Design an enzyme around this catalytic site. Structure first.
Site, PDB file in Angstrom:
ATOM      1  N   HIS A 195       0.868  -1.224   0.000  1.00  8.13           N
ATOM      2  CA  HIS A 195       0.000   0.000   0.000  1.00  8.13           C
ATOM      3  C   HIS A 195       0.874   1.234   0.000  1.00  8.13           C
ATOM      4  CE1 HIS A 195       0.072   0.308   4.555  1.00  8.13           C
ATOM      5  NE2 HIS A 195      -0.142   1.583   4.254  1.00  8.13           N
ATOM      6  N   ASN A 231      17.386  12.164  11.687  1.00 12.88           N
ATOM      7  CA  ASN A 231      16.440  13.258  11.432  1.00 12.88           C
ATOM      8  C   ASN A 231      16.209  13.304   9.946  1.00 12.88           C
ATOM      9  OD1 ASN A 231      15.367  15.858  11.041  1.00 12.88           O
ATOM     10  ND2 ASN A 231      15.955  16.425  13.122  1.00 12.88           N
ATOM     11  N   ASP A 262       0.146  -7.579   1.846  1.00 15.98           N
ATOM     12  CA  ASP A 262       0.606  -6.167   1.776  1.00 15.98           C
ATOM     13  C   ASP A 262       2.125  -6.104   1.889  1.00 15.98           C
ATOM     14  OD1 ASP A 262       0.655  -3.431   1.700  1.00 15.98           O
ATOM     15  OD2 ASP A 262      -0.126  -3.133   3.764  1.00 15.98           O
ATOM     16  N   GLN A 289      -0.001   6.117  11.084  1.00 14.96           N
ATOM     17  CA  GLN A 289       0.215   6.680   9.756  1.00 14.96           C
ATOM     18  C   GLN A 289       1.617   7.180   9.605  1.00 14.96           C
ATOM     19  OE1 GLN A 289      -3.258   6.678  11.120  1.00 14.96           O
ATOM     20  NE2 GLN A 289      -3.506   5.498   9.255  1.00 14.96           N
ATOM     21  N   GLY A 290       2.220   6.863   8.466  1.00 14.67           N
ATOM     22  CA  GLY A 290       3.656   7.262   8.240  1.00 14.67           C
ATOM     23  C   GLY A 290       4.640   6.238   8.632  1.00 14.67           C
ATOM     24  N   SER A 307       3.872   3.035   8.007  1.00 17.71           N
ATOM     25  CA  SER A 307       3.556   1.923   7.076  1.00 17.71           C
ATOM     26  C   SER A 307       4.771   1.558   6.226  1.00 17.71           C
ATOM     27  CB  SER A 307       2.438   2.373   6.133  1.00 17.71           C
ATOM     28  OG  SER A 307       1.216   2.445   6.822  1.00 17.71           O
ATOM     29  N   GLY A 308       4.901   0.250   6.008  1.00 20.87           N
ATOM     30  CA  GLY A 308       5.997  -0.281   5.271  1.00 20.87           C
ATOM     31  C   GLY A 308       7.241  -0.597   6.055  1.00 20.87           C
TER      32      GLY A 308
HETATM   33 CA   LIG Z   1      18.902  13.137   7.744  1.00 23.79          CA
END
Ligand SMILES: [Ca+2]
Length: 223
Positions: free
Chosen positions: A40, A54, A84, A174-175, A177-178
């Site tokens: 997805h 970061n 998935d 959320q974010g 994922s994967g």
């Molecule tokens: Ca960086």
């Protein structure tokens, strides 16, 4: 990651960020040429970012490598999120080092009750929004299949497992994922879905990587 902790720069050296002008999903480096993520998370135009802590500051350990190819699982169903899983080939091989390293694929499937490390740059709030810049981590146990099915009736296949805490407070989101779920030093899960984040009785649901090792190995032997 809601209810997690700051990992510490480059302590999760297999974690990648997928970037299309912005971070949008995690992934896991499985060898110098290939990343495993969620189907997805498929997008055209992906740059793989390795060696990140970061994601908004260039700190000096990153490798930014374009994807050449993405391969969504042949049986991926976007409605149910069954299967998935996706492979992403890098245009050129990463340079592996202390901060950029592959994670092993499993031989056996992980056990209910095993504590795993889940990580990512996703939302850190259950209610509302806040996205961290630095990588977050969470230790969470695999739940029994019966508990997983009871949480999500009619929705859990044998290609999924739940992990987390039924009382709420700690989960991927959320974010994330994967990204990786690592248990006994192997990639056992992919962050896939869940109802909300960190809500009571709604644990995270993860792609069961052990079901896909023969597809992964034949695909990377062929592409
Ligand atoms: Ca960086």
């Amino acid at each position: 990651i809601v209810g997690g902790y700051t990992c510490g720069a480059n302590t999760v050296p297999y974690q990648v960020s997928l970037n299309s002008g912005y971070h949008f999903c995690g992934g896991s480096l499985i060898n110098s040429q290939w990343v495993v993520s969620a189907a997805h998370c498929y997008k055209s135009g992906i740059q793989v970012r390795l060696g990140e802590d970061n994601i908004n500051v260039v700190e000096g350990n990153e490798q930014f490598i374009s994807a050449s190819k993405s391969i969504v699982h042949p049986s991926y169903n976007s409605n149910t999120l069954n299967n998935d899983i996706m492979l992403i080939k890098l245009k050129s091989a990463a340079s592996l080092n202390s901060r950029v390293a592959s994670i092993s694929l499993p031989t056996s499937c992980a056990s209910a009750g095993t504590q795993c490390l889940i990580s990512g740059w996703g939302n850190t709030k259950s209610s509302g929004t806040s996205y961290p810049d630095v990588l977050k981590c969470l230790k969470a146990p695999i739940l029994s299949d019966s508990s997983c099915k009871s949480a999500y009736p009619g929705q859990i296949t044998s290609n999924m497992f739940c992990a987390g805490y039924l009382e709420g407070g700690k989960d991927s989101c959320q974010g994330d994922s994967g990204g990786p779920v690592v248990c006994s030093g192997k990639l056992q899960g992919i962050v896939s879905w869940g109802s909300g984040c960190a809500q009571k009785n709604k644990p995270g649901v993860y792609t069961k990587v052990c079901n896909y090792v023969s597809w992964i190995k034949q695909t990377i032997a062929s592409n």
